[PDB]
C-alpha cells in the first residue's frame, strides 16, 4: 500500500517526518499490512496552488 | 490536506471506513490541522495492477 | 496541460463528456494553450472511497 | 469533486488564480455540484519533466 | 522509485504483466536503482474517461 | 498511455531524458501503442518526502 499526501508548504522537517511515521502506522494497522511494506509520498505545494470553492487557498 | 491511498482489492467496506478514519486522524495530529478539512481518496486496484520488483503482486 | 478529475460514481457518459469539454476549454482559455493539446483523465470512485473529515462521503 | 492540474512552469500567480476559478466553475456546472465543495490542486513542473513520444517537452 | 501508469481498458492479463516488467526494467536501468525496489501501479480507465482536445477518446 | 514517475531529486537533466526515453519505449512496446502518443510526467521530490516503512528515505 502506497499513500500520496498533498500538503501546503510551510511544515518543518520534523513535522513531515512525524507525518510519514503516523500515516504509515495507520495504514499498516488498518490494512493488516507489514509496516516495512508501506510507502509514503509527500507532494508539497505553495498555498496558491491550492484552490477552495474557486478561490486560491491564499484567498 | 488530502491523502490519496493506493490499495489492492479485497478489503470490506467497514475495513475501508477504518482506513479513512485512522489515516485522517493521523494527518490531523501530525500537521496540527483541523480534522474537518482532511479529505481522503481511496484508489483501489486488482492485484495484477500492482507491480513489485517487475512482477505482478498476483505473482 | 493535463487535468486529472477525481469524481464519485453516479454520472452518465454524456455528463462526463460535458465535464471533459468544459474543463478542457477552462484550461485552454486560462493558460492560453491550444484546446487540442489539453488531456483530461477522469478517475471515478465509489462514494465510500471518499472521506470527508474522517467519514466516508456515503457517511 | 477534486481536480489535479499538471502544468509547465511559467505562469504568473494571477494566471493560476484564473485557472483555479474557471476550472472550479466548469466542474460545479458540469457535475451539478456546489461550487464551494470543489477543490483544485495545481502540480507544476519544469519543462524537461514532461515527455512527448520519448523526448522532453523542452525538446 | 514508483511509476503510475494510466492506460485505457482492454489490455490482456499477459500484456499488463509485460508492461509492469518492462517499465520496471526501464526505471531500474536509467535511474541505476535495484530492480527489487521499483513499484509500478496500473490505473486503468474506460476509453471515455480519457479526453483529448475537449473530446472523449472513444469519440 | 501516460506514465507519472515519482523519483527522488538529484538526477541530471540528461539522466531524466534517458528515463523519459526508456520508459516510453517500454510502454509503447508492451502495449504496442505508437511511441509518439506516449506521454511521461516526472514528479520529483526531496529525499525526506519519501517514506519507506515509516522512515524518511533520507533516514
UniProtKB/Swiss-Prot annotation, chains A, B, C, D, E, F:
NCBIfam families, A to Z: PRK02220.1 (NF002571), taut (TIGR00013)
Entry annotated with the keyword Transcription regulation: no
Protein name: 2-hydroxymuconate tautomerase
GO BP terms: toluene catabolic process
Organism: Pseudomonas sp. (strain CF600)
Enzyme class of the recorded protein, top EC level: isomerase
Subunit and interaction comment: Homohexamer.
CDD domains: 4Oxalocrotonate_Tautomerase
PANTHER family: 2-HYDROXYMUCONATE TAUTOMERASE, TAUTOMERASE-RELATED
Pfam families assigned to the protein according to its UniProt record, in alphabetical order: Tautomerase
E.C. designation(s): 5.3.2.6
Catalytic residue positions: 1
Record keywords, A-Z: Aromatic hydrocarbons catabolism, Isomerase, Plasmid
Similarity annotation: Belongs to the 4-oxalocrotonate tautomerase family.
Catalysed reactions listed for this entry: (2Z,4E)-2-hydroxyhexa-2,4-dienedioate = (3E)-2-oxohex-3-enedioate
Gene name in the database record: dmpI
Annotated InterPro entries: 4-OT, 4-OT-like_dom, Tautomerase/MIF_sf
Pathway(s): Xenobiotic degradation; toluene degradation
One GO MF term: isomerase activity
Chain's role: Catalyzes the ketonization of 2-hydroxymuconate stereoselectively to yield 2-oxo-3-hexenedioate.
Amino acid at each position: 500500500p502506497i499513500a500520496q499526501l498533498y500538503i501546503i508548504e510551510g511544515r518543518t522537517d520534523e513535522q513531515k517526518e512525524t507525518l510519514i511515521r503516523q500515516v504509515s502506522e495507520a495504514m499498516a494497522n488498518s490494512l493488516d499490512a507489514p509496516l516495512e511494506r508501506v510507502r509514503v509520498l509527500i507532494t508539497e505545494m505553495p498555498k496558491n496552488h491550492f484552490g477552495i470553492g474557486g478561490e486560491p487557498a491564499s484567498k
